Design a binder for these strands. Structure first.
Lengths: 297, 63, 439
DNA sequence: TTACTGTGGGAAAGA
DNA sequence: AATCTTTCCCACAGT
């Protein structure tokens, strides 16, 4: 099983040829808040699946054990895991416990979880690795920690349900760890200028490249990191033939416009429908921008 | 092992800040040329109408 | 200000059928340029379908407005007409007119459909790509909106012997059509009416063409469809499909099939047929506006003779579908920038929960609604909106219970929506669920 | 029938 | 260069 092949269910039609009562108490508890009871054995956990097809750790992971039951989770996990457990079982939404973990950002629980032979890699219904989620809700550490398994760095470039990678998602969200969460990935083992190539193939995922996303409605800190660190040809075009500038110009981020211009990013080249940054900015009525172009050359 | 339990929840927030920040700023910008927008449309969308009628007037003249 | 009221919304969300307005636009992903003065009509032809019964109600909301706005002192049947003009990256073309007139002869749940088979691009249009442009409005000079399709490539002529626009991709959509000797009138297109396949003269259907992998439910892989590969054709609307089939090349009514063909990716507008998996002599064919299997003659070992209407031209087609409804009487302005929600994501935990939506044409003037519960929406790009999951308690009540309350897993899944700060719902068709452990 | 108009095949011109 | 693509060129079968 990989992203490349999926499971498609559908009806059918053939052409002729010629005319002539269960509510798992353990679970609810585990779910609940505090109450730890019932046997926590091999039959206890591992085997039981409800209507969400979630295992005990699944619910344990669900740090949603609100009302607060702090440190017990990490422990109440370690329990069912050391009493045997498919530390890699998937729930309704194809979520491995370890995932719901990063979702709730229980970095500790994760730490053990992985140590128990858990695989971050295994993506969910959202064709999203664990690293995506880390990035998804920009929890710096959470990823800097997971970036130590050989197998994870492997799937560094792999792209989610919307054909986005690590940085791709990073550059897409702002903040202060971001610009570092990046330095991380690039250090870890990821090319800065990756367009989706290992996917140009079928799966309609593709186009842009990090810088695009930053550019697209600011994230300056990154566009500066990318066009300033080394690389990112500000003159790259997505499957719609767009230069970040354009994207930027389209959305209306004068801030980014100027930097890019200043750095020598072609304003000449046009998109797919023979349009260009101005005409775009102009088209969505972003005069501020329009004028900036005519204020140039 | 045995490290952390939360995660800098103040980055995530300082972030959801910056974002809500541009969302408001950008809600402005769109509310600005908003009429200019509906204008370029209001007209070109009717330029077809009077283009319709006169090319629809024909069905009336020839009878 | 015609903002939306929880109550009104329910009236909608409850009977979408008796309200909602769907309008879909099918079209080719590639068009053949025309030279000098000739006209080479696009084929298949871009056609617009008007779906839902809200199109009737939409009429009245104006019918009782032209008269109930007349007030003072045969031109009535005219102020309710559907006026629509489709056009290309027009720069010199007037912009063709689709019928939709009340005085049209017919010849399921489809209000009315029209096809634009006069469209064509000249060599005078020196653009590499171009997208359709449709404008809808009412006879009484009343606006509706203005749309545009996905990009369309321009080709000089279909190559005989970028690549996602010149090869058909494992998970893409196409149409299969048959034609006869230098003429049009006889054009048939693989389509599916009432849970069954056939071959329309009127319209054509978009079929996701899957690359079969291994094993009702089956394996599908990623990769350009190559001649001699098991292909599964699924209709994009209904869901229905056709049996396993091995797409194969054909030249002059002859099923070319040696070994040096599995090194050939199925190009656009080429002809080909689908031979069954078991009786590798049978080909998917239509014998007069109705499809059936067929045992075509054998000729050599590296070729095969087939029936005329057994070999068709395959071409990647795409489509767009717009769903919208006027929460409070038609609005002054039009809809035009109409949002299209792609996928819905979520990250973080409970108090840090966040919903990511993805799509195109996202205007900051939109507020996302979990069912009947609006949220502090955040516009980032016109391709994404983040929003905080509202507390379950405040979503469904003694009234909204049965509808927001999953009748199956007794959970709570509510229909997501993008709303215009002017009383208009843009139904994403997606749904947010709440894992509930009761009963 | 003569005049006119899409479409498909194929030669010739460029890339 | 060896081959593919683009621009011509034109016959067929309807209006």
């Amino acid at each position: 099983r990989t992203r490349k092949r999926r499971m498609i269910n559908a009806s059918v039609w053939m052409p002729p040829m010629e005319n002539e009562e269960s509510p798992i108490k353990l679970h609810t508890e585990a779910a609940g808040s505090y109450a730890i009871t019932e046997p926590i054995t091999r039959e206890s956990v591992n085997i039981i699946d409800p209507r969400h097809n979630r295992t005990v750790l699944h619910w344990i992971a669900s740090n949603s054990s609100a009302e607060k039951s702090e440190d017990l989770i990490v422990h109440e996990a370690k329990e069912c895991i050391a009493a045997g457990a498919d530390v890699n079982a998937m729930d309704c939404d194809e979520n491995t416990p370890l995932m719901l973990a990063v979702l709730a950002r229980r970095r500790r629980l994760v730490a053990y979880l992985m140590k128990a032979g858990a695989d971050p890699t295994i993506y969910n219904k959202s064709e999203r690795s664990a690293l995506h989620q880390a990035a998804a809700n920009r929890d710096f550490g959470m990823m800097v920690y997971m970036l130590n398994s050989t197998k994870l760095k492997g799937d560094i470039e792999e792209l989610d349900r919307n054909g986005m990678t690590a940085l791709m998602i990073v550059a897409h969200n702002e903040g202060r760890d971001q610009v570092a969460s990046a330095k991380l990935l690039v250090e870890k083992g990821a090319k800065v200028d990756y367009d989706g190539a290992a996917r140009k193939d079928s799966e309609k995922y593709k186009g842009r490249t990090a810088l695009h996303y930053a550019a697209q409605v600011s994230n300056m800190p990154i566009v500066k990191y990318l066009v300033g660190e080394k690389g990112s040809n500000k003159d790259k075009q997505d499957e719609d033939g767009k230069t970040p500038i354009m994207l930027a110009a389209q959305e209306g981020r004068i801030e980014v416009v100027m930097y890019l211009i200043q750095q020598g990013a072609s304003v000449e080249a046009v998109d797919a429908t023979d349009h260009t940054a101005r005409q775009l900015a102009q088209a969505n009525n972003h005069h501020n921008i329009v004028d900036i172009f005519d204020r140039c050359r | 092992e045995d490290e952390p339990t939360i995660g800098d929840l103040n980055a995530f927030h300082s972030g959801e800040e910056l974002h809500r920040q541009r969302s408001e700023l950008a809600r402005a910008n769109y509310e600005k040329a908003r009429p200019e927008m509906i204008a370029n449309q209001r007209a070109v969308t009717a330029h077809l109408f009077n283009r319709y009628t006169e090319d629809e007037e024909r069905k009336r003249v020839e009878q | 200000v015609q903002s939306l009221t929880s109550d009104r919304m329910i009236d909608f969300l409850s009977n979408k059928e008796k309200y909602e307005c769907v309008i879909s636009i099918f079209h080719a992903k590639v068009a053949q340029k025309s030279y000098g003065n000739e006209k080479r009509f696009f084929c298949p032809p871009p056609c617009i379908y008007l779906i839902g019964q809200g199109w009737k109600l939409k009429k009245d909301r104006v019918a009782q407005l032209y008269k109930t706005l007349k007030a003072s002192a045969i031109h009535e049947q005219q102020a309710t007409e559907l006026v629509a003009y489709i056009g290309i990256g027009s720069d010199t073309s007037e912009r063709q007119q689709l019928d939709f007139s009340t005085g049209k002869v017919r010849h399921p749940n489809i209000y009315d459909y029209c096809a634009a088979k006069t469209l064509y691009i000249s060599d005078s249009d020196k653009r590499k790509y171009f997208d359709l442009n449709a404008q809808f409005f009412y006879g009484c000079g009343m606006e509706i909106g203005g749309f545009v399709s996905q990009r369309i490539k321009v080709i000089s002529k279909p190559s005989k012997k970028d690549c996602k626009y010149l090869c058909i991709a494992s998970g893409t959509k196409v149409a299969l059509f048959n034609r006869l000797r230098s003429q049009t009138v006889s054009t048939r297109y693989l389509h599916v009416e009432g849970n069954a396949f056939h071959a329309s003269s009127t319209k054509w259907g978009a079929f996701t063409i899957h690359l079969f992998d291994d094993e009702d439910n089956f394996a599908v892989r990623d990769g350009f469809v190559y001649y001699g590969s098991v292909v599964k054709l699924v209709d994009s609307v209904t869901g229905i499909a056709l049996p396993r089939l091995r797409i194969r090349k054909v030249d002059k009514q002859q099923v070319i099939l040696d070994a040096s063909c599995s090194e050939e990716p199925v190009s656009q507008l080429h002809k080909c047929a689908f031979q069954m998996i078991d009786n590798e002599l049978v080909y998917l064919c239509l014998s007069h506006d109705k499809i059936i299997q067929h045992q075509a003659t054998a000729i050599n070992e590296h070729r095969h003779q087939i029936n005329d209407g057994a070999a068709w031209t395959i071409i990647s087609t795409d489509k767009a579908e717009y769903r919208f409804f006027e929460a409070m009487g038609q609005v002054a302005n039009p809809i035009s920038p109409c949002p299209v929600v792609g996928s819905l994501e979520v990250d973080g935990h409970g108090e840090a929960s966040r919903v990511e939506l993805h799509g195109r044409d996202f205007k900051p003037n939109l507020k996302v609604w979990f069912g009947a519960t609006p949220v502090e929406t955040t516009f980032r790009s016109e391709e994404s909106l983040h929003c905080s999951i509202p507390p379950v308690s405040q979503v469904r009540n003694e009234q909204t219970h049965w509808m927001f309350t999953n009748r199956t897993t007794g959970d709570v899944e509510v229909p997501i929506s993008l709303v215009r700060d002017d009383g208009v719902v843009y139904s994403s068709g997606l749904t947010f669920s709440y894992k509930s452990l009761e009963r």
